[PDB]
């Protein structure tokens, strides 16, 4: 079995070489360069609308591409579609199993995908000839529970399941086309790139990975966290991404230089992070902590610049719209709130 320990030492020496080459290309921290700019004073954001009607915890919320309609998922088995401007509801799609943990909105506004604990992704059609909403597709090829799913296109969808794997499917044929493996823990969050050619996924053991959908292999890996990964979001530019965690610490990684840049940690927070989202210009990094309120962490200064404390329970989802006009937050108190 000398081949085994030989390969172990080979892998360890390769990792040491990678670490030394990674740290060698670093000359100055990002905080040192961004020391001659004026930070934002105070981001005072007040609530505008209060979307009510849910009767259980809220686990998923997504914005449409038209910045007007949103989709929400809850434990009572409903998939209500909200109109953000007039607070009216547009659909009340029911679900087969009332155990859901993710939801998505198609970029064309035709279909809506939803996962859950039954390791099955259901895709509903909203533009049928009749007046109801039918189940267009039902993808079932995962063993572990689904945690997140994103519409790469109107015909392709990429999901990240609980059995340490991700899958890129084809809706019309019903079978998966590509399978991304390599994580040793439960993949519980992924994010697609703005150009929708690469994506990132954070495992359950202090690790994130960058995959390409064409070749289907891992290009780079990022580490530095201690507890685990809980939420990831790309930078609007597409060359960096912010990664949350549970040990009251979020970080910013770069894709071109596979090394950590900044970390946004405070000694007054000992609670985990559930959702991480950027701004329209990539200057305000909204983070949702499970201590009954959110934060408006600055991106380039790592200094808190606002608190959206208008919530009653743990915030489970938050999302900025496409044009950056407002942000939506959904917590476990069955109340969505719009901030502008």
């Amino acid at each position: 079995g000398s081949e085994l320990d030989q390969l172990r030492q080979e892998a360890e020496q390769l990792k040491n070489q990678i670490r030394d080459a990674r740290k060698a290309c670093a000359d100055a921290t990002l905080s040192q360069i961004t020391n001659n700019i004026d930070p934002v004073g105070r981001i005072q954001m007040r609530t505008r609308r209060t979307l009510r009607g849910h009767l259980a915890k809220i686990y998923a919320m997504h914005w449409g591409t038209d910045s007007r309609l949103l989709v929400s998922a809850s434990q009572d088995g409903k998939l209500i579609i909200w109109d953000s401007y007039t607070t009216n509801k547009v659909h009340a799609i029911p679900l087969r199993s009332s155990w859901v943990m993710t939801c998505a909105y198609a970029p064309s506004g035709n279909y809506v995908a939803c996962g859950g604990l039954d390791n099955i992704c259901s895709i509903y059609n909203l533009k049928t000839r009749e007046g109801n909403v039918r189940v267009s597709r039902e993808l079932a090829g995962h063993t572990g529970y689904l945690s997140c799913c994103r519409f790469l296109d109107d015909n392709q969808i990429v999901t990240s399941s609980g059995d340490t794997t991700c899958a890129l499917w084809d809706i019309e044929t019903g079978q998966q086309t590509t399978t991304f493996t390599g994580h040793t823990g439960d993949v519980m969050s992924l994010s697609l790139a703005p150009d929708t050619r690469l994506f990132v996924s954070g495992a359950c053991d202090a690790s994130a990975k960058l995959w390409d959908v064409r070749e289907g292999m891992c290009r780079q890996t990022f580490t530095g966290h201690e507890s685990d990964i809980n939420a990831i979001c790309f930078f609007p530019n597409g060359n960096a991404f912010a990664t949350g965690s549970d040990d009251a610490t979020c970080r910013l990684f770069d894709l071109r230089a596979d090394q950590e840049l900044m970390t946004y940690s405070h000694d007054n927070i000992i609670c985990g992070i559930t959702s991480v989202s950027f701004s329209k210009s990539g200057r305000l990094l909204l983070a949702g902590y499970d201590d009954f309120n959110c934060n408006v962490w600055d991106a380039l200064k790592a200094d808190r610049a606002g608190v959206l404390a208008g919530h009653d329970n743990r915030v489970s989802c938050l999302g900025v719209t496409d044009d950056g006009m407002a942000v939506a937050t959904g917590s476990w108190d069955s109340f969505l709130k719009i901030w502008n």
């Binding site: 961004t34 060359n239 960096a240 230089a257 090394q259 840049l261 990539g282």
Partner: peptide, 11 residues
């Protein structure tokens, strides 16, 4: 690899 200063300036 690329230098951190260049990525910082780009950001």
């Amino acid at each position: 690899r690329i230098k951190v200063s260049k990525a910082a300036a780009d950001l």
